[PDB]
């Protein structure tokens, strides 16, 4: 409801935020489960599903 009130009657209703939410899907929804970066590896395995 906070989101609804903040973006009450945007371009149509939001018409922008939903677009970046699709872009916000990055670093997520990918076959990769653990982000490697050199000797530091972070595994988003438990949180993935």
């Amino acid at each position: 409801e906070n989101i609804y009130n903040r973006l009450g009657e945007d371009l149509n209703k939001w018409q922008a935020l939903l677009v970046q939410i699709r872009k916000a899907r990055g670093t997520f929804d990918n076959a990769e489960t653990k982000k490697e970066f050199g000797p530091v590896v972070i595994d988003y395995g438990k949180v993935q599903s």
Binding site: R25, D29, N30, A31
Partner: peptide
Amino acid sequence: AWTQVLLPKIKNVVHELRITNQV
């Protein structure tokens, strides 16, 4: 011989099924 092998060294072809944006 290759045909009956299909049914001669043969490479193993692989492909996967995945889902993205719930597709």
